[PDB]
Amino acid sequence: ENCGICRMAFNGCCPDCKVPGDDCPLVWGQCSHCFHMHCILKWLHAQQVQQHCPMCRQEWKFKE
Ligand SMILES: [Zn+2]
Ligand SMILES: [Zn+2]
Ligand SMILES: [Zn+2]
């Protein structure tokens, strides 16, 4: 069976990981659907609001 986002096999990696062979773990939802972590990450990042700082208008980014 295949990841719902990238439509590549679960038993293999997502498109980012094919060339350089990085680890590409799977994740599961309570709804029972499985995705490559990398794929669902792109999804969740795009769908989530970009938060701002509680105290100013700037996008919230952690200082590293
Ligand atoms: Zn995928
Ligand atoms: Zn991957
Ligand atoms: Zn689902």
XYZ file of N, CA and C and ligand atoms in Angstrom:
195
model
N 0.837 -1.189 0.000
C 0.000 0.000 0.000
C 0.879 1.249 0.000
N 0.273 2.382 -0.323
C 1.014 3.616 -0.574
C 0.605 4.767 0.343
N 1.577 5.600 0.698
C 1.326 6.851 1.412
C 0.274 7.685 0.685
N -0.704 8.194 1.426
C -1.788 8.965 0.838
C -1.390 10.301 0.220
N -0.237 10.823 0.607
C 0.190 12.124 0.109
C 1.046 11.975 -1.154
N 2.123 11.199 -1.063
C 3.112 11.103 -2.136
C 2.860 9.896 -3.042
N 1.973 9.011 -2.595
C 1.571 7.836 -3.375
C 2.739 6.893 -3.705
N 3.768 6.918 -2.874
C 4.857 5.969 -2.974
C 4.628 4.881 -1.923
N 5.222 3.714 -2.143
C 5.078 2.604 -1.202
C 5.437 2.944 0.264
N 4.624 2.461 1.208
C 4.942 2.579 2.634
C 6.236 1.861 2.986
N 6.503 0.765 2.288
C 7.642 -0.079 2.614
C 8.931 0.556 2.145
N 8.816 1.679 1.439
C 9.986 2.414 1.007
C 9.887 3.854 1.473
N 10.795 4.694 0.996
C 10.844 6.079 1.470
C 10.016 7.036 0.615
N 9.835 8.252 1.125
C 9.158 9.344 0.411
C 10.109 9.891 -0.652
N 9.622 10.807 -1.507
C 10.462 11.287 -2.615
C 11.718 12.025 -2.143
N 11.682 12.670 -0.980
C 12.864 13.417 -0.525
C 14.025 12.491 -0.215
N 13.692 11.254 0.114
C 14.637 10.384 0.795
C 15.254 9.362 -0.143
N 14.738 9.299 -1.367
C 15.122 8.263 -2.326
C 16.568 8.392 -2.760
N 16.928 9.592 -3.192
C 18.288 9.826 -3.637
C 19.309 9.469 -2.569
N 19.271 10.148 -1.432
C 20.373 10.125 -0.472
C 20.092 9.130 0.606
N 19.080 8.323 0.371
C 18.743 7.333 1.361
C 18.779 7.774 2.817
N 17.942 8.731 3.200
C 17.785 9.053 4.615
C 16.712 8.147 5.222
N 16.762 7.960 6.538
C 15.664 7.328 7.273
C 14.392 8.086 6.947
N 13.298 7.354 6.793
C 12.034 7.965 6.406
C 10.920 7.207 7.134
N 10.698 7.534 8.403
C 9.772 6.747 9.225
C 8.312 6.999 8.861
N 7.439 6.077 9.275
C 6.011 6.192 9.057
C 5.292 6.689 10.298
N 4.120 7.282 10.094
C 3.282 7.717 11.216
C 1.837 7.344 10.963
N 1.078 7.189 12.041
C -0.300 6.736 11.928
C -1.226 7.708 12.602
N -2.424 7.854 12.037
C -3.443 8.692 12.637
C -4.521 7.859 13.314
N -5.276 8.477 14.220
C -6.376 7.793 14.911
C -7.442 7.351 13.909
N -7.477 8.021 12.765
C -8.394 7.669 11.688
C -7.916 6.447 10.928
N -6.729 5.958 11.269
C -6.206 4.732 10.676
C -5.421 4.928 9.392
N -5.119 6.167 9.022
C -4.351 6.367 7.797
C -2.885 6.512 8.142
N -2.038 5.990 7.273
C -0.609 5.992 7.510
C 0.046 6.905 6.476
N 1.109 7.605 6.868
C 1.853 8.457 5.933
C 3.321 8.377 6.272
N 4.199 8.687 5.317
C 5.568 9.003 5.689
C 5.509 10.249 6.573
N 6.267 10.236 7.662
C 6.434 11.399 8.518
C 6.752 12.663 7.726
N 7.689 12.549 6.777
C 8.084 13.712 5.975
C 6.909 14.300 5.201
N 6.049 13.421 4.693
C 4.881 13.856 3.945
C 3.845 14.535 4.837
N 3.471 13.906 5.953
C 2.457 14.501 6.818
C 3.013 15.783 7.423
N 4.323 15.827 7.645
C 4.928 17.085 8.098
C 4.710 18.268 7.146
N 4.904 18.057 5.837
C 4.630 19.091 4.836
C 3.176 19.506 4.871
N 2.302 18.523 5.020
C 0.868 18.785 5.122
C 0.555 19.680 6.331
N 1.004 19.268 7.514
C 0.650 19.961 8.745
C 1.258 21.336 8.772
N 2.443 21.477 8.184
C 3.080 22.789 8.169
C 2.294 23.750 7.286
N 1.806 23.247 6.166
C 1.093 24.111 5.231
C -0.287 24.480 5.784
N -0.937 23.535 6.445
C -2.307 23.785 6.932
C -2.382 24.595 8.222
N -1.309 24.604 9.001
C -1.309 25.276 10.307
C -1.113 26.779 10.111
N -1.699 27.597 10.988
C -1.473 29.031 10.930
C -0.021 29.327 11.266
N 0.535 30.379 10.695
C 1.855 30.798 11.139
C 1.637 31.677 12.364
N 2.058 31.221 13.540
C 1.752 31.976 14.757
C 2.622 33.205 14.820
N 2.125 34.213 15.520
C 2.924 35.384 15.791
C 3.336 35.371 17.255
N 4.275 36.232 17.592
C 4.720 36.373 18.971
C 3.561 36.896 19.830
N 3.454 36.418 21.078
C 2.370 36.904 21.928
C 2.396 38.423 22.124
N 3.572 39.030 22.000
C 3.789 40.414 22.434
C 4.135 41.385 21.302
N 4.288 40.868 20.088
C 4.542 41.714 18.924
C 3.971 41.078 17.660
N 4.095 41.761 16.528
C 3.458 41.251 15.321
C 4.283 40.230 14.564
N 5.549 40.083 14.935
C 6.448 39.212 14.177
C 6.031 37.748 14.271
N 6.291 36.996 13.209
C 6.106 35.555 13.254
C 6.919 35.016 14.404
N 6.378 34.013 15.078
C 7.092 33.413 16.193
C 8.118 32.447 15.648
N 9.380 32.701 15.990
C 10.476 31.771 15.710
C 11.346 31.648 16.939
N 11.737 30.430 17.285
C 12.551 30.266 18.477
C 13.954 30.755 18.171
N 14.525 31.488 19.112
C 15.922 31.880 19.011
C 16.777 30.665 19.305
N 17.705 30.348 18.403
C 18.578 29.193 18.594
C 19.975 29.597 19.069
Zn 4.671 9.827 1.525
Zn 11.321 10.759 3.642
Zn -7.608 9.461 7.682
